[model samples]
Target: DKPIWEQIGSSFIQHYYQLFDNDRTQLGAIYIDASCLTWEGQQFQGKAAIVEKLSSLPFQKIQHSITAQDHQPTPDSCIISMVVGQLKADEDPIMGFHQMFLLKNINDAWVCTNDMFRLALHN
Candidate 1:
């Protein structure tokens, strides 16, 4: 049986990817002023900056296939989620990716405070 935190984390993961695939511009709902994202090596702070960065991705469409994910409740009362997956962008071949998030409850709403994403490549 999944605990309440697991349930929330799972649901958030599902909802996040769904929104990303459909319309990432709407993803601002889960971010706030203190949020930050590190995409590849570039860093973006604040919800507006993060949203703009995501919205400006070269791909017009994308789909994610999650391979595995883990969620843990931190001692600081935050949820830490990590996901490893493959994704297809437009007509390109699928590439592996890993993403992590730090989620916290503010005003009874869960928001992502820190995010890190990278394309998993083997050279």
Candidate 2:
């Protein structure tokens, strides 16, 4: 683990979902104008759209536990992380999910520039 990729695949993912679980408003800091999101099938581009899309979730709370992760570092201090995990929302059964993030380091901080989320074939 070079810490660059591991940091985003581990600690950052946990923290992102922590805020996503409780206070989604706190997520703005990590997103920038170029951010992108593909939730299930719909596409949302930009930080505002992504946040709005997430905020529109039918469930108010969410929790994700990463079961498997793949991280790769690219040129220009950017990294791509694909994570397989389980997600649970109030009163629902656990569901398997896959999320991919294209992160770029900005001023020593990892920022998610692109993101995609989808349900896994089976839980």
Expressed as tens digits, the lDDT of each residue in 20-117 for candidate 1 is 99999999988888899999989999999999999999999999988998999989999999999999999998899999999999999888999999
Q: Backbone clash tally for model 2?
A: 0
Clashing residue pair totals per candidate (backbone < 3 A): 0, 0
lDDT of model 1 at position 28: 94
Best by lDDT: 1
What 10-residue stretch in candidate 2 is worst by lDDT? 1-10
lDDT of 2 at 1: 41
Cα deviation of 111 in candidate 2 (Å)?
Answer: 0.2
How much lDDT does each candidate structure score?
A: 0.92, 0.83
Q: Total backbone clashes of model 1?
A: 0
